[PDB]
DNA sequence: TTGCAGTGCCCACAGAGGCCAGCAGGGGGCGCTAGTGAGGTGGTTTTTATATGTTTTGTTATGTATTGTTTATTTTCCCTTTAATTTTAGGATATGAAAACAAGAAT
């Protein structure tokens, strides 16, 4: 485990994908990459029978599509609710990240440093 | 009624941001095995140790040989007394040698 861990600092990727440029830190990530070229798909969502490449994708599918009463995530800055955490990530990166050079209002001279305040104005 | 100045509405293509699969990042827990590492047991020999038999060493007793001891028969040194043995006259013998006599021979 520690031998495998040290590549997280160094960056060694001693496992090459013979069919593309990808290179993984350990055996499992390479075996998981192989399904995309071979097209093998061992796992199956038992409810809708929709097809997926990856187990975790299926688990998130079940959680968002065939599950009830699941907790959501509220943006701290704005008042909108959205389902997935990673989409809350992309929301904070595209709308509430600090914009260095600023953006000016289309109709007045006021300049803003966050896209949210701009759209709100 | 119209031209002009200003408004309403409908569309649409952009723009935007949540939705979504895909995919890669670090880390937790299991399936299985090669390869030593060490520890324990068994076998082997072996080595120390012990006991028995044989022989070697030490001690004891008997016989032989050596040294000493008072006899003890030589033996040998020293007397006084004879028994040959020697020496010195003294008389007698003998054998010689002159001496006298007698006998040839010569002058
Ligand atoms: Zn590849
Ligand atoms: Zn499903
Ligand atoms: Zn927000
Ligand atoms: Zn403005």
UniProtKB/Swiss-Prot annotation:
The modification Phosphoserine is found at residue 38. It comes from the Eukaryota. The modification Phosphothreonine is found at residue 10. Ubiquitous. Absent in primary spermatocytes. Transmembrane segments: none annotated. It is found in: Nucleus, Nucleoplasm; Chromosome; Chromosome, Centromere. Coiled coil: none annotated. It is linked to Intellectual developmental disorder, autosomal dominant 21: A disorder characterized by significantly below average general intellectual functioning associated with impairments in adaptive behavior and manifested during the developmental period. Additional MRD21 features include short stature, microcephaly, and developmental delay. The 11 zinc fingers are highly conserved among vertebrates, exhibiting almost identical amino acid sequences. Different subsets or combination of individual zinc fingers gives the ability to CTCF to recognize multiple DNA target sites. Interacts with CHD8. Interacts with LLPH. Interacts with CENPE. Interacts with BRD2; promoting BRD2 recruitment to chromatin. More than 13'00 CTCF-binding sites in potential insulators were identified in the human genome. Belongs to the CTCF zinc-finger protein family. Chromatin binding factor that binds to DNA sequence specific sites and regulates the 3D structure of chromatin. Binds together strands of DNA, thus forming chromatin loops, and anchors DNA to cellular structures, such as the nuclear lamina. Defines the boundaries between active and heterochromatic DNA via binding to chromatin insulators, thereby preventing interaction between promoter and nearby enhancers and silencers. Plays a critical role in the epigenetic regulation. Participates in the allele-specific gene expression at the imprinted IGF2/H19 gene locus. This is Transcriptional repressor CTCF. It comes from Homo sapiens. The chain holds residues 365 to 485 of 727 of the full protein.
